[PDB]
Amino acid sequence: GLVPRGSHMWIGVISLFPEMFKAITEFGVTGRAVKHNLLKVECWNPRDFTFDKHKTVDDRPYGGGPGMLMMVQPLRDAIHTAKAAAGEGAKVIYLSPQGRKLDQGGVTELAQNQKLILVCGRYEGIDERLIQTEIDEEWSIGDYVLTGGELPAMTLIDAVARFIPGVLGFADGLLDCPHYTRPEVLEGLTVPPVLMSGHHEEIRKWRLKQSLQRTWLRRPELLEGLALTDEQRKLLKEAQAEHN
Amino acid sequence: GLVPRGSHMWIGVISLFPEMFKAITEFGVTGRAVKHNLLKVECWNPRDFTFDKHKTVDDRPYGGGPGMLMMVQPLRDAIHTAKAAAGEGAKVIYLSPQGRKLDQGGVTELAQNQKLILVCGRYEGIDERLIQTEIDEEWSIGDYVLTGGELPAMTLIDAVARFIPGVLGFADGLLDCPHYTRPEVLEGLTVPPVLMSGHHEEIRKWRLKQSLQRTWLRRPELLEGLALTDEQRKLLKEAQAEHN
Ligand SMILES: CC(C)(C)c1cccc(C(=O)NCC2(NC(=O)c3cccc4nocc34)CCCCC2)c1
Ligand SMILES: CC(C)(C)c1cccc(C(=O)NCC2(NC(=O)c3cccc4nocc34)CCCCC2)c1
Numbered sequence: 111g112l113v114p115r116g117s118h119m120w121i122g123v124i125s126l127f128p129e130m131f132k133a134i135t136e137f138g139v140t141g142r143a144v145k146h147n148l149l150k151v152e153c154w155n156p157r158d159f160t161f162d163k164h165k166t167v168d169d170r171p172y173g174g175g176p177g178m179l180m181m182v183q184p185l186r187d188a189i190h191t192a193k194a195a196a197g198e199g200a201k202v203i204y205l206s207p208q209g210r211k212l213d214q215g216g217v218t219e220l221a222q223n224q225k226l227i228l229v230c231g232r233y234e235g236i237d238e239r240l241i242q243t244e245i246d247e248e249w250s251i252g253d254y255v256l257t258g259g260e261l262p263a264m265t266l267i268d269a270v271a272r273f274i275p276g277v278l279g280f281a282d283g284l285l286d287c288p289h290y291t292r293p294e295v296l297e298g299l300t301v302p303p304v305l306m307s308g309h310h311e312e313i314r315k316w317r318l319k320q321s322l323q324r325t326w327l328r329r330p331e332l333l334e335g336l337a338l339t340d341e342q343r344k345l346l347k348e349a350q351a352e353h354n
Numbered sequence: 355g356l357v358p359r360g361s362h363m364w365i366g367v368i369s370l371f372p373e374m375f376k377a378i379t380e381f382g383v384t385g386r387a388v389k390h391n392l393l394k395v396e397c398w399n400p401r402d403f404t405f406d407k408h409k410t411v412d413d414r415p416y417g418g419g420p421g422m423l424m425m426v427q428p429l430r431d432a433i434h435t436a437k438a439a440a441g442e443g444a445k446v447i448y449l450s451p452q453g454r455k456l457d458q459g460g461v462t463e464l465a466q467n468q469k470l471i472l473v474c475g476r477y478e479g480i481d482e483r484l485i486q487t488e489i490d491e492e493w494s495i496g497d498y499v500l501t502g503g504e505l506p507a508m509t510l511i512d513a514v515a516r517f518i519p520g521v522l523g524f525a526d527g528l529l530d531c532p533h534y535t536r537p538e539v540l541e542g543l544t545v546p547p548v549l550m551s552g553h554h555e556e557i558r559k560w561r562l563k564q565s566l567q568r569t570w571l572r573r574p575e576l577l578e579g580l581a582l583t584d585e586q587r588k589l590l591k592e593a594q595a596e597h598n
Contacts, residue, residue: 238534239534265509269499272499291415297483328452
C-alpha cells in the first residue's frame with residue numbers, strides 16, 4: 111500500500127432512498143474509490159427509525175397546507191446514529207436550496223473533512239429547529255427546483271472524492287481549452303494545425319490561451335478570484351484584443 | 355386517463371454508465387413518473403457502438419498529454435442512434451462545465467421540449483467539433499469539478515420532470531419560509547406561535563414575509579429578475595427594516 115492508513119474518506123448519508131447511492135458507489139471513479147477502500151459511503155434510512163406500523167417518515171406542517179415535511183423523530187434519530195458511527199469530528203451537511211452555493215473553493219473546503227454526514231431532504235424539507243440542533247452547514251449545488259437532496263449529495267460526493275489520496279494516485283479550475291481527438295477531419299472540420307504540429311511548446315501556449323479566452327467569455331466570474339501569472343495575463347490580453 | 359396522450363416526456367441519454375440512471379428511473383417522483391408512463395428515459399451506451407475487440411471508448415488528444423477524451427466515433431454513433439429513435443424535433447444537450455448555467459428559468463425553457471437527448475461526458479470531455487456537428491445546447495448545473503456528466507444529467511431530468519403533466523396532477527421559485535412540524539417544542543426550541551394559532555390569514559402573511567426575507571439574505575440575485583407584488587414589496591420592506 112502506497113497510501114497512509116488514515117487518509118481514507120468516510121461519508122455517512124441520511125436518505126429515504128439509500129439505493130440511489132449505488133449510482134456513485136458502483137460506477138466510475140467513485141466506484142473504483144469504494145472498491146479500493148479509499149472511499150466509504152454508509153447510508154441510514156429514516157424509514158428504519160420509525161415505530162409506527164406503516165413506517166411513516168413524513169409529517170404535516172404547523173399552520174397547515176399541502177407542503178409535507180420530513181418527520182422529525184425518524185430523521186433526527188437516523189442522524190444521531192450516523193453521528194455515533196462517525197465518532198468525533200464528523201461535519202453534518204444538509205443539502206439544501208437555502209444553503210451556501212457550492213463552487214470549487216467550497217468543494218476544496220469540504221474535502222478537508224475526513225468524515226462527513228450528508229442529510230438529504232424530501233417533501234418540502236426539514237424542520238427549521240433541526241437545522242439549528244443537528245446541522246453544521248447548509249450547501250446548495252445550484253438554483254433550481256429538485257424533488258430531493260440525493261442527487262445534490264451524490265454530486266458533492268463525486269466532487270470531493272477527487273481530493274482523496276489514492277484517487278488519481280488552481281489553473282486547472284479554469285474552463286478547459288477546446289479538445290480535439292481522431293479523426294483529423296470530422297465532417298469537413300479540421301483540427302487546429304498547431305495541435306498536429308508536434309511543437310509541444312506551441313501546443314502548451316495555444317491550449318492555455320484558449321482556456322483563458324473561454325473562461326473570459328463564458329465564466330468571467332471565475333477570473334475575479336485569481337491573480338493570474340504573467341504568462342496567463344499576456345495570453346489573455348492577446349485573446350481579448352484578437353476578439354475584435 | 356386524465357392526461358392527454360401526447361404530453362408524455364421522452365429523454366434519450368448517452369452515457370458510458372447507463373445503470374446509474376436507475377437512481378432516477380426507479381425511485382421517488384421520477385420513479386413514479388416512469389412507472390405511470392409519464393416519463394420515458396432511454397439510454398444508449400457508446401461502448402455498444404465500438405468495433406474493436408476491447409470496446410475502446412476513449413481516445414488520446416491531438417497535441418498529447420494525459421487528458422483522455424471520449425472516442426469520437428462510438429459517441430457520435432450513439433448520438434445518431436438516439437436521434438433516429440427520437441424522430442424529428444429532439445434537442446441535443448451536452449451536460450458540460452462550459453455550458454450555460456442552469457437555473458429555474460433555464461429548467462422551464464428546457465421543459466418545453468417533449469423530446470430531449472442528453473449527452474454525458476467522461477474523461478476530459480468530447481471533441482470540440484462534435485459540439486458543432488451534433489450538440490444543440492450546452493448546459494451546466496454548477497461551477498465545480500466532477501468526474502462525469504451523468505449526475506448533472508440526472509439533476510436536469512429531476513428538475514424538468516416536475517413540469518410533466520400528470521406529475522403532481524414564480525413566487526414558488528423564491529426560497530421557502532422556515533418549516534415547522536411536530537413536536538411543539540424540540541429540545542427546548544418552540545414553534546413560532548402564529549403557526550400554532552389557527553389564524554390562517556396571519557399564517558399566510560407570516561410565511562410569505564419569511565420567504566421574502568430569507569431570499570433577500572441568502573439569494574438576493576433571485577429578486578433581481580422579478581417585479582414583486584404590492585403585498586410582497588410591503589412585507590419585504592418590513593422585514594428589511596426589522597433586520598436592523
Ligand atoms: C430558489 C430555488 C433554489 C430554485 C428553490 C426554491 C424553493 C425550493 C427549492 C427546492 O428545490 N426545494 C426542494 C428540495 N431541493 C433540494 O434539496 C435542492 C434543490 C436545488 C439544489 C440543491 N442542493 O442541495 C439540495 C438542493 C428537495 C426536497 C427537500 C427540500 C429541498 C428550490
Ligand atoms: C470551472 C469548472 C466548472 C470548475 C470546471 C473547469 C474544468 C473542468 C471541469 C469539470 O468538471 N470537468 C469534468 C466534466 N464535468 C462535467 O461534466 C460537469 C461539471 C460540473 C457541472 C456540470 N454540469 O453538467 C456537466 C458538468 C466531467 C467529465 C467530462 C468533462 C466534463 C469543471
